[PDB]
Structures are given as structure tokens and as C-alpha cells.
């Protein structure tokens, strides 16, 4: 009876895989980036990457390889998920719409199977006869690639060697032949087998088994010209073949493990080698000509090329360009040069891609004082480590802001034909037109020539020929640049006036009620051309330079008044081409077609708040696609702006937005302002490159933020950040970090680079005297990061071998100071379990960190939370609750000790709490009167916990090492010794992400209950809320209906995706909504929407209300 809802806030940003090839077409070079459940398809260009296609999969991508079966024009995509969904995928373009089709699929998972060490390996043989799969120990699986087999049937072949490190198919081989390093007693080896598929046997390979290095771990199969196998291990690199053997051991590559390779030239002459330190190598195969024999291997060599971000994936592209897929840091695009620069670096960055990395911990703050949540993460590790400040929405920087009421429009206007800066932006008051004589400092109310202070401007653009145009209510007027005198004018033959403007820089292309003219202001006059009349009253107009026009404009957008329609004409012309009935009863308020970068659309804002958008085209003249999306509750007002190279649409309303686009699909992001009525781009004197903003009853000018839905800050650290707390009174963050140092010549330890803890402004060390009785070591610190500048104000170092595990910031009992507190442990590589450790009580009143209280403990203080003005804490399977004397010391209260490793704690504000490792979870209350711990209930499942959260009094949420979520509840029935003692897992759902931290808060605030944010190893941010039974059921319903509707890449079943899955068991998801799924209801076509409303009422327009309302939870 538990009802919950999970949505993604930020997609996974860590890169898990990346392959290069010819998937879009044969003339075409692609790069496929795998994230987790997402697949990214780019085309390699002279500049970098052409985004072409991003989809989602219903599983974690675990193998991703491209191949070419017999007689296929382009490559196919092989993919294998971690739940053992295999499919072959194809790229099909048909239309201007792209589709990723499943050639074949099936689940290749076996009942008999122990998931080996080093996980899943998916290889494909060079002739494309077969795909080799190593899922479990002692078995090799084989999916034959004959044009039948669309279901992907497989056989297994008992593998005598039950501990394989790595495997590849060998090039230049008569039968399919494997090559792999394995471990037994006696060390590590390489062996070869041929694979015969007629036989389903493993036949003797082409060459005798040799021994290789104890740490050999990578097998590269060299292409036909050389055709052997390189073997990468700590310290050693070696080529094997038939009876060839070659072996270099350059002492450079001993410092750090090689973890990833990539082939550079197709013949196998040069490779890339990714190191755990981020160093990039070139492995060079010295090739040597006989005349007749075959081209051979002379020698092996390594060049230290330089430094990338810590590479997990790596792929060479066109012409020196290499993509660097990182999991621990930002992914990048780098250049390889033949000549080094200063410091000997052949490598140069071109582009850097945000990875929110492993998010090891986080918290939510109100940084900018407003009730909007801001999220700050501990991200990355080692040299990639960092903080990331994450903000919802787009921001603007407020300068001088004149409290100027009732304003009605504005345009980019100057007072000269000179400086591209401007001094007066004549707008339009309530029925009126006014003047802002502004030196770019202070404003003035001296009114101007011909711009009568009792009429109104509709358009007012930079019209050449020495004039300051003023298409007014009455009818277009003229005030000269230099002369400033009233030049020429217009007036309606009857007694009538312009009602709707529309122009560029040489036109007056307006409307009088239903009439539509065109009056040219050449060298200071008026010059009419074409004329029609509308069946209805004209509401709005669009025309602007589109194609290769300057003066006279080509096409024509029209929003009419009684039939509620938007139509496509010409202008001149006005002829009918496409009438789109918008339906309902609110008239269009603004109309726009626009240059994105490459592709065109139509957008129309009704006066209710909604907006429609279509598939236009600035050259033919005909509409297509339909979509509806609501913004404001007031009539929305549109405008284009160019900020970088590209052009977006600012939408003005009570909920001001910006219209964007990914590939060329449409995105709608908030702007972080109160309300906005009118707006225009700028470039001024006292306020250069900018945006003018007419609001409720003020005005404003300032610059504008990035683009994305999310804003992301980034404070690099060059060491591993591990925990984080905000202290408001101190107005700073406490952050726990770790840095690596190696063995010194004098046995000491130093450091490979400047870290945040070494470069800290003030510093200090641990003067505790208790624990006193080629080599790597972790030095651990507590950093004091400033709140606004994010500089490292102070760095305290801990004892040698003291790891900092936990961190809190709080008041304790009657003392009115805020201490920060840290819980540590004495780690020696040898010792299996920490025997010692301490809780340390710091004070940062100002300037420095004072040690205020120190308390020895008997194990690793894995975590601690503030209680009720007490200190709750766990110590190596023990949960103590310390009190804080008026004499400044922590004295013990009670301790629970029935648990195996208590890793995680949270507190039901009051007196209840969770905690318990490997077991699963446990509920526990503090009995005030007794001064005691009472174990209330327990969940009895073998969940290896990673995170824990109290949703409420009777709901406990938990994340487990197998990418599952679940919810526990105490039973609501009699016999309070038994049933009230166990707690039922009332919710089950498979996330597909590893969760490190839950914490209550939200990014939205300027249908659902509660807000719990969560961060993941992959840099994915997620959100959990609660639901009523009816919502749950409405939503549950809509999910099955949708599954039927939505085509899935590869054709994997959504129910199978979201199922709970461990080694022990597999269950359908319960009590959980896949908000991502629910949300994707808005992307499907109008036909497909109706398909699932069928059957209080039941309507699609109605459903998109509910989903639009759900989307704004995050």
C-alpha cells in the first residue's frame, strides 16, 4: 500500500563506452557515446561533433560494438544490457525524422550462471560469423550471425578455464579463434581455442599456451598485417603470435595502471593507452619489410603523449582528434600534435564536457537568498575531483532598474547612426509614448519631437536613410535622424487607424482591423505596394528577412480573430496557402517563424498562456507537425534574440521562458524572474551587450545566463572530495577531502600535484597525541570553502593514516555555538577492520579551526547525524548517542549493537532512526524517559545498502548495491511482538543507477507530497515524491497503456526494465511510478495520445494537463 514516483532531473553524464564507425551512412564517420541508459550519436566534423541522435534504452548499456555483416551498406549496432537484453540496431533516416530500428533481439541470460569477475565481455569475430559473450565463469556463449536468427538464439560452450581476465577474437585466422589471459594457481597465461559452430566444441587453437605477467589484463588483437595479440599488464607490454614473442618494459608505465586502449591506424601500427593517472601514451609497432615473406614486427615502443582527464573510454577520430570518455571526470575532445609545446605536451584540449562524475555526497542550500534550492555536489575523484553548484533555470544580472510603471513595448533604439550603443529606448506607456534621455547612468523626462507623448508606437526598428521610425496608433509617423522634424505621415482615408504593426528595417507592413496594406518609408516618405482584406479581424502579424532578403520581406504569418486561426501567406501577397484552425475560443496574441540554426517552425501564443508550434519552412509555405505547450496564465508575448552564435525565442508572460532546441527538437526552460511583459535584445552605452526587460511596474537591463534547463558552476579541487556540509552562521561549506602522496626517497610522503588542501589560504595540522605507539598513501583533510567565492579559506590535516568518513555541522545541547564535527578512522592497508578512530569537534568562529573536543573510539565512525541536540553516531557496528556536557565533552549515552556494520543513519526529526549494513535496514526509537534505544522493527532481506532515507513516519526508502530502490513500512496489524516487529517491503523498483546520497529538498520552488533528491555514481540526479492512491492508479493505468503505444529501441519490455533484480530474486515493480515514462507521454503523436485515454471523464488534452503539472516537480 505504498505509492511513490521517481523522475530524472539530470541525465547520467558519466561516459561508460564509446565506439567509432559508419552507422549513419558509409560516407560518414560517427561517434557513439554510451552513457548508461542513453545512447549518443554524433557525426565527426572538421570542427568537432555533429549531434545527430540521442535515444534512451530500457537497461544499462554493457557492451556496445559496431559491425558489418555480409553485404550491408552501413554498420550495424550491437548492444547488450546488464540484464542480458541483446539486440542488433540500425540507423534509418527516411524523411527528415530519424529512427533507430531493431533488426534483432532476445534475452541471453542463463539460469545456470555465476556472473564472473571483470563482468560482461562482448566480442565480435573479424568475419562476422559470430558474437562471443563471456557472461559467467566456465561458460562461453555464442550468438551466430546468420541472416536468420532474428530472435538471436545462442549456444554455450563449457570453458575449461573458470577465471578469465580478458578475451578477444584474433585477426588473420582461418577459423574463428579466441585469445584470452586467465588466472589459476601457477600465475597467469594466454591460451587459444578455435570456435567451431557446426560442432559447438572448442578445438585446439593455433598456438601453444605461454605464461604472461601476474598483472596482465588487456588483450588487443592486432589486424591482419601483423595479426597477433598484445598483452598489457603492470610493468610489462608484450606481443605474441604463433612462435613470435616481443617484450618491452619501459619504466615509465609502471607508475600507474594502463586501463584503456584504442587503435589509431587500421593496420595496427599505432595505439592509444589510457593510464589511471590520466597520462596518454602512444604504443608504436615498429613494422619491418622483407621483400617476400609477410610484413613483420621489429620492435615495440611507447611515447608519453601528455595528460587527459582520467579515461575510461577512448577513441581516435579524424586527423589528430581524440575523444576522451571519462567516468571520474569531465569528458573531452583533445588534439594530438606532432611537436610538443612547453612541458613536452603533445595533447591540447579543444572541448570539455560536464560530468557530474561520481557524486559521492551532496546538500541543498539557498545560496542566492531566494526560496530556490541550490544543489552542491562532491564530484569526481583524484585530480578530477570538484564541487558542482547546480541551479534550476536561466538567470539575469540586474543593474539600474527604473521604477517605471505601465509600459507597453520596446525595441532596440539609439539616438545616432554612430556608436552601435544606444542612449534612449523609447517604449510605450498606457496608451502613450514616452522618452528616456539616458546617458547610460540616469534617466530623464524630456519628451521628443513627433513622438507625441499622447500616442503609441507598435514597431520601431533601425531603419536606414537617416530616420527614427515610429509606426503609431494613429498611423506611421516620421521623425528624421539629423533634422528631427516631422518628415512625412500617414492617415486612414476614413477616420481609421493601424491596429497591428509588423516590420524589419525598411517596411510598414500593417493591418487596419481586417485590412492589410504595406507603406514604404524610403528616403523620408511613404510608398505603398499590395493590398487585401481578411474574412476576420486581424490579431497579430509576422514578417522578417528570411532567405536572402533585406528590405522587402518574403512570407507572411497571420493570427485572426473569430475563427481563431493562424495562416501562411505572402507579403507583398496575402494569398491563402494553409489555414490552421487553432480551435477553442481565445484569440492568438503573437505569431513567429524563426531561424534556429538550420530548420524552420511556426509558433503561436494564445492569450490563455498556451502556445502551439508547427513544421514550417521559410521558402515554400506550408505547415506540418502539431504540438501544444502552456507557459503563462496570461497572454504570452514573443521575441527573438541572439546571445552566442545562435538564435532563440524569449517568451514574455507570468512565468517567463526561453524557447530552445537540442538537436532540433524543442526545449522550454524557465527564466528566474518574477514577471516579464515586454523584452528586447540590446548592446548599449551604460549597459552593453544585454536584454531590456519591461516588467509588471518596473524596468530592467542586464545580461543572460547559459542556456540549459540546469545551470552548473564547477569548483575544481585536484583531489577527492568525500563529504559536504553547509554552515550558514559561518557562511561557508565544510568539505572532507583526500589527496594521494607517494613514497619519498627518504621514506616520507610528498604529493604529485598542488591540491586544494595544499593551496589553501590558511592551514593547520592535528596536534592530537593519542594513537602513538613506490608506495601510495591517502592524506585526509577538512576544507573550509567560502560560500560566495568558493575559495579554500582553511585546510586542516588529519593524523597520518586517519581517514575522515563522516561530517556534521550543528549546535549541541545548551551551547549556542556551531561546531563542525568529523568522524574518522585508523586505516592500515594490512588491517581488515579499523580498530581505532575518533570523533573530533571543531570550531570555526572565524579565521581558523580550533579543536574543541576530541574523543577516542574503538572503530570506524562510518556516519553521524545530529539528533535532539545530542550526537547520534555509528562506530563499526554500534550505534551510540553522545551527550554534550556543559564542560565541553562527549559522554556516552546508550548504544544499540545488534547489526553488522552500521553504515547509514537518518532521523525522524523526533526520536526514530534507520541504520544497518549487509543486513538491510532497521528501525529504532529513542525512549526519552528510559534514556534508551529500543529496537522497533527490522527488514529481513539481504540488501547490501548504499543509501537510506526517511520519507515519513511509516515510510523508509533505501538504495542497494544492485541498482534497486525499495520502501519499507511497519505492519498495521495485531500481535505487536511479531508482525509489528517485521517491516514489509511495500515498494520495489529497479533504478539502474547506484545511489550515494539521498537528501530532502527541491530545486524548483520559486498533486505530489515531499521532495527527496538523490545523486548517483553516474552523475545522475533523481527525485522521489509521494502520491495518493488515485494518482498512483491513474498513473499506473496510464503506464501500461503507454507501454503498448511507445516503440522501444531493441524492443525491450518496460516491465522487464523496471523489475526488482538481485542474484536471489526477480519481481515486478510495486508502489512505484517511472516518472520519466509518464513524462514521455508529451512526445508522442496526437493519434497515439488518443489511443490511450479511451476510458470522471477521459481526454488527452486533459492528460497533458496532468503531465505538464507533473513536469514542474523538478
Amino acid at each position: 500500500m505504498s505509492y511513490n514516483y521517481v523522475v530524472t532531473a539530470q541525465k547520467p553524464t558519466a561516459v561508460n563506452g564509446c565506439v567509432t564507425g559508419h552507422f549513419t551512412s558509409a560516407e560518414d564517420l560517427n561517434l557513439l557515446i554510451a552513457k548508461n541508459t542513453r545512447l549518443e550519436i554524433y557525426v565527426v566534423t572538421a570542427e568537432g561533433l555533429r549531434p545527430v541522435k540521442e535515444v534512451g534504452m530500457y537497461g544499462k548499456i554493457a557492451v556496445m560494438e559496431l559491425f558489418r555483416p555480409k553485404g550491408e551498406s552501413k554498420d550495424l549496432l550491437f548492444i547488450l544490457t546488464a540484464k542480458y537484453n541483446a539486440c542488433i540496431l540500425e540507423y534509418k533516416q527516411s524523411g527528415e525524422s530519424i529512427d533507430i530500428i531493431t533488426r534483432a533481439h532476445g534475452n541471453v541470460q542463463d539460469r545456470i550462471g555465476r556472473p564472473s569477475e571483470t563482468g560482461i565481455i562482448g566480442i565480435i569475430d573479424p568475419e562476422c560469423r559470430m558474437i562471443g559473450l563471456r557472461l559467467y565463469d566456465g561458460l562461453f556463449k555464442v550468438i551466430p550471425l546468420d541472416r536468420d536468427n532474428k530472435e538471436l538464439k545462442a549456444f554455450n560452450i563449457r570453458l575449461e578455464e573458470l577465471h578469465v581476465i580478458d578475451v578477444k577474437f584474433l585477426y588473420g585466422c582461418q577459423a574463428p579463434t579466441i585469445c584470452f589471459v586467465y588466472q589459476d594457481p601457477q600465475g597467469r597465461h594466454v591460451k587459444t581455442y578455435e570456435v567451431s559452430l557446426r560442432e559447438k566444441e572448442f578445438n585446439k587453437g593455433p598456438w601453444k599456451q605461454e605464461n604472461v605477467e601476474a598483472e596482465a589484463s588487456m588483450v588487443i588483437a592486432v589486424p591482419e598485417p601483423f595479426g597477433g595479440a598484445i598483452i598489457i599488464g603492470q610493468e610489462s607490454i608484450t606481443y605474441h603470435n604463433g612462435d613470435k614473442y616481443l617484450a618491452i618494459a619501459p619504466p615509465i608505465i609502471k607508475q600507474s595502471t594502463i586501463v584503456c586502449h584504442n587503435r589509431v591506424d587500421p593496420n595496427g601500427s599505432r595505439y592509444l593507452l589510457g593510464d589511471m593517472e590520466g597520462r596518454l601514451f602512444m604504443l608504436l609497432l615498429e613494422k619491418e619489410e622483407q621483400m617476400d615473406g609477410t610484413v613483420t614486427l621489429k620492435d615495440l615502443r611507447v611515447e608519453l603523449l601528455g595528460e587527459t582527464s582520467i579515461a575510461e573510454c577512448l577513441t581516435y577520430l579524424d586527423n589528430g582528434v581524440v575523444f576522451v570518455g571519462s567516468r571520474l571526470g569531465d569528458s573531452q575532445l583533445v588534439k594530438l600534435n606532432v611537436d610538443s609545446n612547453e612541458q613536452g605536451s603533445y595533447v591540447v584540449a579543444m572541448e570539455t564536457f560536464t560530468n557530474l562524475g561520481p557524486i559521492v555526497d551532496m546538500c541543498v542550500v539557498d545560496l542566492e537568498r531566494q526560496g530556490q534550492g541550490q544543489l552542491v555536489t562532491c564530484s569526481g575523484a583524484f585530480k578530477e575531483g570538484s564541487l558542482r553548484i547546480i541551479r534550476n533555470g536561466i538567470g539575469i544580472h540586474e543593474h539600474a532598474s527604473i521604477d517605471l510603471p505601465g509600459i507597453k513595448g520596446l525595441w532596440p533604439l539609439r539616438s545616432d547612426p554612430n556608436r552601435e550603443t544606444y542612449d534612449t529606448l523609447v517604449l510605450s506607456f498606457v496608451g502613450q509614448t514616452r522618452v528616456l534621455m539616458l546617458n547610460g547612468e540616469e534617466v530623464e523626462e524630456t519628451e521628443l519631437m513627433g513622438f507625441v507623448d499622447d500616442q503609441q508606437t507598435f514597431f520601431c526598428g533601425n531603419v536606414a536613410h537617416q530616420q527614427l521610425i515610429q509606426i503609431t496608433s494613429a498611423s506611421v509617423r516620421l521623425v528624421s535622424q539629423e533634422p528631427k522634424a516631422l518628415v512625412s505621415e500617414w492617415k486612414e482615408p476614413q477616420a481609421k487607424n493601424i491596429s497591428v504593426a509588423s516590420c524589419n528595417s525598411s517596411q510598414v507592413v500593417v493591418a487596419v482591423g481586417r485590412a492589410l496594406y504595406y507603406l514604404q518609408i524610403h528616403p523620408q516618405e511613404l510608398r505603398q505596394i499590395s493590398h487585401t482584406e481578411m474574412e476576420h479581424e486581424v490579431a497579430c502579424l509576422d514578417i522578417t528577412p528570411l532567405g536572402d532578403s533585406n528590405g522587402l520581406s518574403p512570407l507572411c504569418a497571420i493570427g485572426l480573430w473569430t475563427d481563431i486561426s493562424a495562416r501562411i501567406l505572402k507579403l507583398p501577397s496575402f494569398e491563402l496557402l494553409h489555414k490552421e484552425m487553432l480551435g477553442g475560443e481565445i484569440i492568438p496574441r503573437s505569431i513567429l517563424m524563426t531561424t534556429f540554426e538550420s530548420s524552420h517552425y511556426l509558433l503561436c501564443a494564445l492569450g490563455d498562456g498556451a502556445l502551439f508550434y508547427f513544421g514550417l519552412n521559410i521558402e515554400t509555405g506550408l505547415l506540418s507537425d502539431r504540438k501544444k505547450v502552456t507557459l503563462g496564465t496570461q497572454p504570452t508575448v514573443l521575441r527573438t534574440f541572439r546571445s552566442l552564435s545562435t538564435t532563440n525565442v524569449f517568451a514574455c508572460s507570468d512565468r517567463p521562458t526561453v524557447i530552445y532546441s537540442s538537436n532540433h527538437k524543442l526545449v522550454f526552460s524557465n527564466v528566474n524572474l518574477k514577471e516579464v511583459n515586454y523584452m528586447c535584445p540590446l548592446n548599449s552605452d551604460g549597459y552593453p551587450d544585454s536584454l531590456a526587460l519591461a516588467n509588471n511596474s518596473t524596468l530592467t537591463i542586464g545580461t543572460i545566463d547559459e542556456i540549459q534547463k540546469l545551470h552548473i558552476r564547477t569548483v575544481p579541487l585536484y583531489e577527492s572530495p568525500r563529504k559536504i556540509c553547509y554552515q550558514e552562521v559561518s557562511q561557508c561549506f565544510g568539505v572532507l577531502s583526500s589527496r594521494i602522496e607517494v613514497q619519498d626517497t627518504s621514506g616520507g610522503t610528498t604529493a604529485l600535484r598542488p591540491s586544494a588542501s595544499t593551496q589553501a589560504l590558511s592551514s593547520s595540522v592535528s596536534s592530537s597525541k593519542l594513537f602513538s605507539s613506490g608506495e601510495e598513501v591517502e592524506v585526509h583533510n577538512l576544507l573550509i570553502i567560502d560560500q560566495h567565492t568558493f575559495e579554500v579559506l582553511h585546510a586542516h590535516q588529519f593524523l597520518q593514516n586517519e581517514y575522515a568518513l563522516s561530517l556534521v555541522s550543528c549546535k549541541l545541547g545548551k551551547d549556542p555555538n556551531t561546531y563542525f564535527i568529523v568522524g574518522t578512522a585508523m586505516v592500515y592497508p594490512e588491517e581488515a577492520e579499523p580498530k581505532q578512530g575518533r570523533i573530533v569537534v571543531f570550531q570555526y568562529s572565524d579565521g581558523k579551526l580550533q579543536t574543541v573536543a576530541e574523543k577516542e573510539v574503538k572503530g570506524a565512525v562510518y556516519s553521524m547525524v545530529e539528533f535532539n541536540g545530542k550526537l547520534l553516531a555509528s562506530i563499526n557496528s554500534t550505534v551510540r548517542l553522545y551527550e554534550w556536557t556543559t564542560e565541553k565533552d562527549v559522554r556516552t549515552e546508550c548504544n544499540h549493537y545488534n547489526n553488522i556494520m552500521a553504515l547509514y543513519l537518518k532521523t525522524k526529526g523526533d526520536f526514530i532512526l534507520v541504520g544497518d549494513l549487509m543486513r538491510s535496514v532497521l528501525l529504532l526509537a529513542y525512549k526519552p524517559m528510559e534514556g534508551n534505544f529500543e529496537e522497533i522493527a527490522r527488514d529481513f532481506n539481504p540488501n547490501w545498502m548504499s543509501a537510506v532515507e526517511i520519507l515519513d513516519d511509516d515510510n523508509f526508502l533505501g538504495a542497494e548495491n544492485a541498482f534497486n530502490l525499495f520502501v519499507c513500512q511497519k505492519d498495521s496489524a495485531a500481535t505487536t511482538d511479531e508482525e509489528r516487529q517485521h517491516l514489509q517491503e511495500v515498494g520495489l523498483f529497479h533504478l539502474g543507477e547506484f545511489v550515494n546520497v539521498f537528501c530532502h529538498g527541491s530545486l524548483v520552488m520559486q498533486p505530489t507530497q515531499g521532495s527527496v533528491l538523490f545523486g548517483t555514481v553516474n552523475g545522475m540526479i533523481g527525485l522521489v515524491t509521494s502520491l495518493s492512491e488515485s494518482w498512483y492508479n491513474l498513473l499506473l493505468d496510464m503506464q501500461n497503456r503507454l507501454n503498448k503505444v511507445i516503440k522501444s529501441v531493441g524492443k525491450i519490455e518496460h516491465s522487464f526494465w523496471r523489475s526488482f533484480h538481485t542474484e536471489r530474486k526477480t519481481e515486478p515493480a510495486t508502489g512505484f511510478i517511472d516518472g520519466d515514462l509518464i513524462e514521455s507521454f508529451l512526445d508522442i503523436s496526437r493519434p497515439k495520445m488518443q489511443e490511450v485515454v479511451a476510458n470522471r471523464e477521459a481526454t488527452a488534452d486533459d492528460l497533458i494537463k496532468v503531465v505538464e503539472e507533473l513536469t514542474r516537480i523538478h
Binding site: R722, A825, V827, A832, P834, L903, F994
Partner: peptide, 14 residues
């Protein structure tokens, strides 16, 4: 050192 092995998981490792 379980502490180590432990933290490694947080970084998504063996």
C-alpha cells in the same frame, strides 16, 4: 581495510 573496498563502491569500483 574494508573502509577502502567500501569507499571504492561509492566511486563505482570492485
Amino acid at each position: 581495510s574494508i573502509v577502502r573496498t567500501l569507499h571504492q563502491h561509492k566511486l563505482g569500483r570492485a
